[PDB]
């Protein structure tokens, strides 16, 4: 990835100015609920002057990090996809349930990872992803053996490292993991990437057991879904209580969203606390509101 | 009138979660 100079920013503003332009087309029907791209935009645009400010006289130093190139790349890459998303959907991007919208909501997801990470990476505005402290002891010592202080590596680099502490039993078996870690969807691995995934799949002892039944092999979980995807998509089984689903949560990032069906007739969203999300699952089984994986008969046993 | 990246202030409306029911 290129050098990162005041130029290339400036590029990266007016392409972002023409996604928010875009979406305020009152045709789009657009939801303000998270994740929302006429917040998510400003707000990287507002933490990218933080930066550029912190480091005014030291863009030369600010330039040349390594995290900070890759993600004015991608954030570049992103905003091109999503301009090129509008030309290309053209009357479709005005349908919900159309392809073009659905992946205008998964950019919207994507954008809000990139933003959550880079205000995790430069809080406050300046770089301290060396000194990142990863949340699990044991999924911390890891990183650091295998990577040090870096911030950022190269998936086939963590794909490397972590088959040598956990074996990754297949091919596609790595596309899913990849698919699951790499959140926003650049080929690189962050130690905050790497922070999200190892809390929603702790214990690190058994880090891709537990991600194998909690989402490799379960109807339940949801890739890339939002708050309103999930109500929408729980919509045809309000007359089946019990019927859940759940997924990560956009705005705790590092916590899941379990979406249920009550008895009354609602559709609630729980983030559980205090527990992990195997208990909560298998409580919620056990107490009558966790039955129906995205509406099946049968449930995981997660025993 | 179509805000433009700058003039744009969030407003960070929230989704509703509520609590676990066990
Ligand atoms: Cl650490
Ligand atoms: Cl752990
Ligand atoms: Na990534």
Not at chain 1, 122 to 127: C, E, M, N
Not at chain 1, 147 to 151: M, R, S, V, W
Not at chain 1, 215 to 219: D, L, M
């Given at each position: 990835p290129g050098t990162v100079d005041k130029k290339m920013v400036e590029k990266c503003w007016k392409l972002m100015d023409k996604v928010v332009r875009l979406c305020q087309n009152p045709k789009l029907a657009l939801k303000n609920s998270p994740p929302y791209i006429l917040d998510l935009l400003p707000d990287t645009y507002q933490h990218l002057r933080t930066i550029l400010s912190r480091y005014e006289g030291k863009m030369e130093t600010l330039g040349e990090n390594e995290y900070f190139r890759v993600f004015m790349e991608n954030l570049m890459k992103k905003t091109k996809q999503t301009i090129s998303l509008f030309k290309e959907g053209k009357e479709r991007m005005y349908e919900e349930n159309s392809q073009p919208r659905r992946n205008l909501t998964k950019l919207s997801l994507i954008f809000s990872h990139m933003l959550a990470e880079l205000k995790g990476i430069?809080?406050?505005?300046?770089?301290q992803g060396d000194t990142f402290r990863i949340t699990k002891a044991d999924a911390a010592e890891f990183w650091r053996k295998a990577?040090?202080?870096?911030?950022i590596v190269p998936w086939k680099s963590f794909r490397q490292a972590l088959h040598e502490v956990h074996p990754i039993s297949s091919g596609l078996e790595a596309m899913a993991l990849k698919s699951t870690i790499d959140l926003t969807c650049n080929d690189y691995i962050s130690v905050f990437e790497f922070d999200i995934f190892t809390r929603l799949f702790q214990p690190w002892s058994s880090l891709l057991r537990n991600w194998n039944s909690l989402?490799?092999?379960?109807?339940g979980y949801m890739a890339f879904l939002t708050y309103d995807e999930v109500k929408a998509r729980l919509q045809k089984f309000?007359?089946?209580?019990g019927s859940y689903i759940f997924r990560l949560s956009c705005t705790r990032l590092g916590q899941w969203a379990i979406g249920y069906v009550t008895a009354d007739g609602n559709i609630l969203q729980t983030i559980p606390h205090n527990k992990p999300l195997f208990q909560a699952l298998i409580d919620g089984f056990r107490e009558g509101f966790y039955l129906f994986p995205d509406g099946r008969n049968q449930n995981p046993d997660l025993t | 009138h179509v805000l433009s990246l700058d003039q744009i202030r969030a407003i960070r409306n929230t989704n509703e979660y509520t609590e676990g029911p066990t």
């Open positions: 430069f809080p406050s505005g300046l770089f990577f040090g202080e870096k911030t989402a490799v092999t379960h109807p309000i007359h089946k209580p | -």
